[PDB]
Symmetry: D3
Subunit: 175 residues, 6 copies
């Protein structure tokens, strides 16, 4: 099952991300169901927005929104929902939503998958346009869903991302 | 596994549908294999037709064609094969095929996924064009497959759909 | 050429819309060039948004942004850029942008193309979700493009849409 | 303009086909407008069917339905609406519809474009499945459009196709 | 799980192939992970090439590259990654790569799925273009990945393919 | 017509490129016909390769292969065949093919369309992977077409690209 995938080969620098939503896809918000491992439709998004990157989570982690910690993974081509990608964290967008605090990690494909992202070492190496698109997306994607809301609080660096990974891996572990 | 998804949160009004074939897709007829939970290609359809809605089944049900009961789910965008959608039954197309009687339920995305279909309470609220397309599809999609055939017998309302769900949930339960 | 297509068979109730951008497409903002009739890339949109409907213009009209008046056309399936669709106006989103006032008409496929939209007679017959998505789109799609901006000013009815069509058809005519 | 493309390099064996509808596409029935050369939406098809091959016409020809003669062109990948393909006729499906008699030619990509279809010399060399799909399509695609109808009358060989081409090229020529 | 799918209904003539990569897809090289059954991104291919056919493996087999034996499956439409197709072997491209010897079987959809490939009995019945495309693909797809390499050694017939299947099914069985 | 588009707003630094083939598309080699302006299928490519970037030409130029000079344009999303993009030359891949010498320019979207490529000033600023993919593509895409061949001769800088543009604009001008 997708429930039995590790958090990573060597957390926090070498992680696996389970993809739920491909980059640039139709506005279907899929989420993996914890007990079955199946991809469920969480909702049909109301705004005419798309995720700027592939979107998923790190297995065996727990955030403060009651879900595994969330990751954006830029790739040259969109990934399949339910697939798993080896990546390296490079930054994090801090934010809270209606279900609790809910950081959005950015992790790039691992060097072994591709050399394309090897030059992205830290958050300042991400394209400004991409970071700005990601922030705008999270600021606005819930604008038409009553009872769903966001506070975006800014970008933090790879060490912050890594600290989040470690802390979420510790959370699910005695939870 | 997709074999461990419930029939629904509160059958028959609140169901889960496992999707096998997206709306408006290529003519590959996928079916979930009961023992592995995998998506198998059942066949390459011979007619140049597509399913008017996403197509799948309710887990832990049994129809008279030896398969779980079949459901059509209209959505704004096609769903992924193998994904699961929470829905609400609104009508049923009665029909029989070569493998035995084989009703085609229509269920719309649950209000929690989207408000888009909340106005569809019963079968008369479905668009006439959509119902007519669905009936035509089932009347003709097997026209070029020898030994596969259909008798479409007309549309019935949400209570009939719900009765079918309950009865199929009872069938698999002592089968 | 696409420059020689009429404004419509019987303006303002029966119009032709030249499509520039399909619904639910990649964020490439195409515009027809007036002198060549070719589809040019105006820009690569910076926000992660898509047009909720097909988007184009009525030929031989002139708005206050120096362009033909702009139209959104809902369809069951996205249209090809450069194609032309016969439609019927049903409402208008009033708004201004950096290039001047710039109304966004909504027109549905003509009955002769499809009966699907015949029940949409006026702006109140459009789905609330669709109208809300359209307004949100225009409110936010320029949020990351410096020097591009929007003031959305609300929805008006089919007669207002029709008055706009007539007035823009008169503008280009002694311009 | 697409109005100025020849009927072919050497009719009837070497023709050009202007494509209006790609194979396996969404059910949007495009038609080139004779006076503008633009692709217009003729209608949104009501049945859940797709064209088994790319579909278009031979320029500077005239059929008995008031339109240029119609051609199906099988290709390995769907063609773009408005593109032009060099082909070789191999057979014809005879049929009439509401607008008058309306043969459906089949022509394969010319050897110069690809060697893939060089083995298809005549109608008996077309796959049986493809011919059967084409006939079924034309038998049924108008089943839900009132006032549109078809009589399919069977397959004829490459010489018959070629005779049709010549005769339609003569028709438009003193018409 | 995809790990519990059989090698086939009646090996070697009747096999199941688990698909990892669809025909004509984006250059994402997916591989099923043996212990989780999940689809992992193995790498982002560096060359601008696509697989000429759907690509996957026979479960419960073991090749000399440490992986299940690899199969190409031509279909009329691309298959979903993670789906399973019943097929019949018709030939094999012999080759070695950096991970060891690594034959590429070709197997066509079983007659029960479609009659389309029933005329392909042996390797000489495959289109020359398709075989040539497959060989060229394997000759060149690793050209830009350092440390990945190929020696293509030519085509062999259905009996050779079948012998490979049997031998790989025996290998994993006491391994 | 696409024949009446300028070479550029201010050649050679500010050019327009007419797109014939989108990036990452199916292997249909379209070419604009000079006398009609229509997109014709030149051929169905035999290798399983795709263009790494959008591909087209500069109007009103003439190369030594008897065609307008050829340009690759990287974009975030593939462009429509027949569309026109404003760009800035940054480098050139020198090469000859069977029809004569045939340089492949690389030009990035103009700053006015997007700021994404503003950091690419010269050929050394292009990603190494992209340049390597482009060279490999041209080295191999004709490998299965008899009588079509290539000699790739290496990368040259933006000034070389610009000199090519100027010289081709002069060639068509007294030709
Ligand atoms: Cl773990
Ligand atoms: Cl930002
Ligand atoms: Cl249950
Ligand atoms: Cl009906
Ligand atoms: Cl007019
Ligand atoms: Cl609104
Ligand atoms: Cl002619
Ligand atoms: Cl037939
Ligand atoms: Cl087995
Ligand atoms: Cl070969
Ligand atoms: Cl010029
Ligand atoms: Cl290079
Ligand atoms: F989450
Ligand atoms: F079933
Ligand atoms: F405009
Ligand atoms: F016609
Ligand atoms: F392998
Ligand atoms: F060229
Ligand atoms: Mg959630
Ligand atoms: Mg999450
Ligand atoms: Mg959240
Ligand atoms: Mg979350
Ligand atoms: Mg079945
Ligand atoms: Mg079923
Ligand atoms: Mg059935
Ligand atoms: Mg059934
Ligand atoms: Mg503009
Ligand atoms: Mg406009
Ligand atoms: Mg504007
Ligand atoms: Mg405007
Ligand atoms: Mg017609
Ligand atoms: Mg016609
Ligand atoms: Mg007709
Ligand atoms: Mg006709
Ligand atoms: Mg491998
Ligand atoms: Mg393998
Ligand atoms: Mg290998
Ligand atoms: Mg292998
Ligand atoms: Mg050429
Ligand atoms: Mg060229
Ligand atoms: Mg060339
Ligand atoms: Mg050239
Ligand atoms: Na998309
Ligand atoms: Na909200
Ligand atoms: Na489709
Ligand atoms: Na049948
Ligand atoms: Na899209
Ligand atoms: Na702005
Ligand atoms: Na399609
Ligand atoms: Na009819
Ligand atoms: Na593809
Ligand atoms: Na290599
Ligand atoms: Na593609
Ligand atoms: Na060659």
């Amino acid at each position: 099952s997708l429930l039995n995938v590790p958090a990573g080969k060597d957390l926090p620098e070498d992680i696996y991300v389970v993809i739920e939503i491909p980059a640039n896809a139709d506005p279907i918000k899929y989420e993996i169901d914890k007990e079955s491992g199946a991809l469920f439709v969480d909702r049909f998004m109301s705004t005419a927005m798309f995720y700027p990157c592939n979107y998923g989570y790190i297995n065996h982690t727990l955030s403060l929104d009651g879900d595994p910690v969330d990751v954006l993974v830029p790739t040259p081509y969109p990934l399949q929902p339910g697939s798993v990608t080896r990546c390296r964290p490079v930054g994090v967008l801090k934010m809270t939503d209606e279900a609790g605090e809910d950081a959005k990690l950015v992790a790039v494909p691992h060097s072994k998958l591709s050399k394309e992202y090897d030059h992205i070492k830290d958050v300042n190496d991400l394209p400004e346009l991409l970071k700005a698109q990601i922030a705008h997306f999270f600021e606005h994607y819930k604008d038409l869903e009553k009872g769903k809301w966001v506070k975006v609080e800014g970008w933090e660096n790879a060490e912050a991302a890594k600290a989040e990974i470690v802390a979420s891996f510790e959370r699910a572990k005695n939870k």
